[PDB]
Design a protein around this motif. Structure first.
Motif, PDB file in Angstrom:
ATOM      1  N   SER A 401      38.834  11.324 -13.221  1.00  0.00           N
ATOM      2  CA  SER A 401      37.710  12.061 -12.685  1.00  0.00           C
ATOM      3  C   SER A 401      37.268  11.659 -11.293  1.00  0.00           C
ATOM      4  CB  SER A 401      36.537  11.925 -13.624  1.00  0.00           C
ATOM      5  OG  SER A 401      36.891  12.468 -14.882  1.00  0.00           O
ATOM      6  N   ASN A 402      36.844  12.689 -10.570  1.00  0.00           N
ATOM      7  CA  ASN A 402      36.309  12.621  -9.214  1.00  0.00           C
ATOM      8  C   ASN A 402      37.098  11.891  -8.147  1.00  0.00           C
ATOM      9  OD1 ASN A 402      34.367  13.548  -7.482  1.00  0.00           O
ATOM     10  ND2 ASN A 402      32.722  12.250  -8.269  1.00  0.00           N
ATOM     11  N   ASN A 403      38.398  12.135  -8.060  1.00  0.00           N
ATOM     12  CA  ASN A 403      39.186  11.480  -7.024  1.00  0.00           C
ATOM     13  C   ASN A 403      39.574  12.533  -6.001  1.00  0.00           C
ATOM     14  OD1 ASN A 403      39.611   8.510  -7.749  1.00  0.00           O
ATOM     15  ND2 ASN A 403      40.205   9.499  -9.658  1.00  0.00           N
ATOM     16  N   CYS A 404      40.450  12.170  -5.085  1.00  0.00           N
ATOM     17  CA  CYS A 404      40.877  13.067  -4.041  1.00  0.00           C
ATOM     18  C   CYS A 404      42.153  13.721  -4.462  1.00  0.00           C
ATOM     19  CB  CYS A 404      41.074  12.246  -2.792  1.00  0.00           C
ATOM     20  SG  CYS A 404      39.637  11.224  -2.549  1.00  0.00           S
ATOM     21  N   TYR A 430      37.221  15.451 -14.903  1.00  0.00           N
ATOM     22  CA  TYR A 430      36.005  16.100 -14.438  1.00  0.00           C
ATOM     23  C   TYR A 430      35.936  16.051 -12.918  1.00  0.00           C
ATOM     24  CZ  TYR A 430      33.898  15.276 -19.169  1.00  0.00           C
ATOM     25  OH  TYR A 430      33.573  15.113 -20.495  1.00  0.00           O
ATOM     26  N   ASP A 431      35.180  16.990 -12.357  1.00  0.00           N
ATOM     27  CA  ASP A 431      34.966  17.070 -10.922  1.00  0.00           C
ATOM     28  C   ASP A 431      36.272  17.121 -10.135  1.00  0.00           C
ATOM     29  OD1 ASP A 431      32.283  16.790 -11.825  1.00  0.00           O
ATOM     30  OD2 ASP A 431      32.323  14.605 -11.540  1.00  0.00           O
ATOM     31  N   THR A 432      37.228  17.858 -10.674  1.00  0.00           N
ATOM     32  CA  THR A 432      38.522  18.052 -10.051  1.00  0.00           C
ATOM     33  C   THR A 432      38.717  19.554 -10.147  1.00  0.00           C
ATOM     34  OG1 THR A 432      39.249  16.035 -11.146  1.00  0.00           O
ATOM     35  CG2 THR A 432      40.913  17.354 -10.058  1.00  0.00           C
ATOM     36  N   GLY A 451      48.318  17.950 -29.724  1.00  0.00           N
ATOM     37  CA  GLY A 451      47.807  16.586 -29.864  1.00  0.00           C
ATOM     38  C   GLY A 451      47.502  15.926 -28.523  1.00  0.00           C
ATOM     39  N   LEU A 452      46.942  16.724 -27.618  1.00  0.00           N
ATOM     40  CA  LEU A 452      46.597  16.304 -26.271  1.00  0.00           C
ATOM     41  C   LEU A 452      45.597  17.272 -25.679  1.00  0.00           C
ATOM     42  CD1 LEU A 452      48.667  15.230 -23.229  1.00  0.00           C
ATOM     43  CD2 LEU A 452      47.507  17.409 -23.168  1.00  0.00           C
ATOM     44  N   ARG A 453      44.574  16.720 -25.057  1.00  0.00           N
ATOM     45  CA  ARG A 453      43.570  17.537 -24.425  1.00  0.00           C
ATOM     46  C   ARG A 453      43.332  17.038 -23.007  1.00  0.00           C
ATOM     47  NH1 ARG A 453      39.609  17.662 -27.952  1.00  0.00           N
ATOM     48  NH2 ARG A 453      39.180  15.414 -27.766  1.00  0.00           N
ATOM     49  N   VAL A 454      43.341  17.982 -22.078  1.00  0.00           N
ATOM     50  CA  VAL A 454      43.094  17.706 -20.687  1.00  0.00           C
ATOM     51  C   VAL A 454      41.639  18.126 -20.494  1.00  0.00           C
ATOM     52  CG1 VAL A 454      43.695  18.315 -18.376  1.00  0.00           C
ATOM     53  CG2 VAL A 454      45.450  18.226 -20.149  1.00  0.00           C
ATOM     54  N   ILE A 455      40.732  17.160 -20.479  1.00  0.00           N
ATOM     55  CA  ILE A 455      39.299  17.423 -20.333  1.00  0.00           C
ATOM     56  C   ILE A 455      38.892  17.650 -18.888  1.00  0.00           C
ATOM     57  CG2 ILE A 455      37.030  16.552 -20.817  1.00  0.00           C
ATOM     58  CD1 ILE A 455      38.028  15.024 -22.990  1.00  0.00           C
ATOM     59  N   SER A 456      37.908  18.525 -18.680  1.00  0.00           N
ATOM     60  CA  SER A 456      37.412  18.844 -17.350  1.00  0.00           C
ATOM     61  C   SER A 456      36.065  19.528 -17.429  1.00  0.00           C
ATOM     62  CB  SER A 456      38.397  19.755 -16.648  1.00  0.00           C
ATOM     63  OG  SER A 456      38.845  20.762 -17.540  1.00  0.00           O
TER      64      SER A 456
END
Length: 456
Positions: A401-404, A430-432, A451-456
């Motif tokens: 989360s929140n990187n460049c 998050y914040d991407t 069996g994998l979740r990419v949260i955002s």
């Protein structure tokens, strides 16, 4: 059998659709709805017909004293066995607090109560306590965060404290009890009879002096398991006093929360002796302290001792640079207990991140959750990480989360995730942001491997 509503406003049309179900469910949660006194009349009437409610939670609503009062009336029925009650943020003012004694006494099934974000004032607490004192009250968990209390509240709290025998959790964070108050409060704890387990004193304006007291309580409170003291200006001085208390062979303290406590490397040295000796201390949050790379080093020095059993270390926003990655790296290669490391809001950059990436690439690594939010990772950094994900087998949750990071960086992550060998169960982003194209590629991945979740 739970209900649970959050943020959705209630049209007079659906309120009606609801009421009857409110008489059925075991768990009703009316979190941030548009509930005003107008609804409470109905709630009272619907809750009394519910022979099986174990928990009601009416968070974030402007019910008011009168609204609250009604609510409490409908619970005072023959078929009530309610255990958890949360009237968090309902504008319950001291006026409405005169009900509590008559209510608390009337509800012997109640275990935990939440009155947080309610301006009870010392006047309102004084009555809550008078309620807790009655022998028919077996309250085990009490949350009084942000309740406009002050040092005055500490005496009755202390009095409740010496008398009761059931209370396990006490949380009085975000109340300005001050040095004097904390001294009273803690004093009551020392000669109490209940085996308290969770004590949270966040942002209560504690001072190093209070450390002299906590030192003692901590030393002999065998029942204690989690101690929150963040956002207090204890400094290294306070930590030093606190430390001998933590080395007591009677202290089984498991979770120690010392975030934003104006601690520095000098203090961190003191922490390490504890860190080495106490096999029980398992969670330490030191986030927000200006520890610096010297401190990171010390923490690692400790984490290398095989007699150290820390499982979670939080060092978020601790002024750490890429200069300490070599140690975090090395430690990460030889430690088989640390499962969760929180390094967010630190200036690690792509160079610092690759070092961690190579370490974790070896086999026989145990780190399970690695957080890197706001560390200045760029799309190039993502390359390192993407490889990591194919080599390393211990990770389960990775927070970026929140990187460049833009499309390319993410795309690489996806490439890694589409592999069968990859076992990350959660990529937190998050914040991407990303273009429609990346998203469509993403929604696909979430269907090829559930069996994998990419949260955002």
């Amino acid at each position: 059998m739970n209900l649970d509503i959050h943020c959705e406003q209630l049209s007079d049309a659906r309120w009606t659709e609801l009421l009857p179900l409110l008489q059925q469910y075991e768990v009703v949660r009316l979190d941030d709805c548009g509930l005003t006194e107008e609804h409470c009349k109905d709630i009272g009437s619907a809750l009394r017909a519910n022979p099986s409610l174990t928990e009601l939670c009416l968070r974030t609503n402007e019910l008011g004293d009168a609204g609250v009062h009604l609510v409490l009336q409908g619970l005072q029925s023959p078929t009530c066995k309610i255990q958890k009650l949360s009237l968090q943020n309902c504008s319950l003012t001291e006026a409405g607090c005169g009900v509590l004694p008559s209510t608390l006494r009337s509800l012997p099934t109640l275990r935990e109560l939440h009155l947080s974000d309610n301006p009870l004032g010392d006047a309102g607490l004084r009555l809550l306590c008078e309620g807790l004192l009655d022998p028919q009250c077996h309250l085990e968990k009490l949350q009084l965060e942000y309740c406009r209390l002050t040092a005055a509240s500490c005496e009755p709290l202390a009095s409740v404290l010496r008398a009761t025998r059931a209370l396990k959790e006490l949380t009085v964070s975000n109340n300005d009890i001050g040095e004097a108050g904390a001294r009273v409060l803690g004093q009551g704890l020392a000669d109490s009879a209940c085996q308290l387990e969770t004590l949270r004193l966040e942002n209560c304006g504690l001072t190093p002096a209070n450390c002299k007291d906590l030192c003692g309580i901590v030393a002999s409170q065998a029942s204690l398991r989690e101690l929150d003291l963040g956002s207090n200006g204890l400094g290294d001085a306070g930590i030093a006093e606190l430390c001998p208390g933590l080395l007591s062979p009677a202290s089984r303290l498991k979770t120690l929360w010392l975030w934003e406590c104006d601690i520095t490397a000098s203090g961190c040295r003191d922490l390490c002796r504890v860190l080495q000796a106490k096999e029980t201390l398992k969670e330490l949050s030191l986030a927000g302290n200006k520890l610096g790379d010297e401190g990171a080093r010390l923490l690692c020095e400790s984490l290398l001792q095989p007699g150290c059993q820390l499982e979670s270390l939080w060092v978020k926003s601790c002024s750490l640079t890429a200069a300490c990655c070599q140690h975090v790296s090395l430690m990460l290669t030889q430690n088989k207990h640390l499962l969760e490391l929180q390094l967010s809001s630190n200036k690690l950059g792509d160079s610092g991140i690759q070092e961690l990436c190579q370490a974790l690439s070896q086999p026989g690594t145990t780190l399970r959750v690695l957080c890197l939010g706001d560390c200045e990772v760029t799309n190039s950094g993502c390359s390192s990480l993407a490889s990591l994900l194919l080599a390393n087998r211990s990770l389960r949750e990775l927070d970026l989360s929140n990187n460049c990071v833009g499309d390319p960086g993410v795309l690489q992550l996806l490439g890694s995730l589409e592999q069968p060998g990859c076992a990350l169960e959660q990529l937190v982003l998050y914040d991407t942001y990303w273009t429609e194209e990346v998203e469509d590629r993403l929604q696909a991945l979430e269907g090829s491997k559930p069996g994998l979740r990419v949260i955002s």
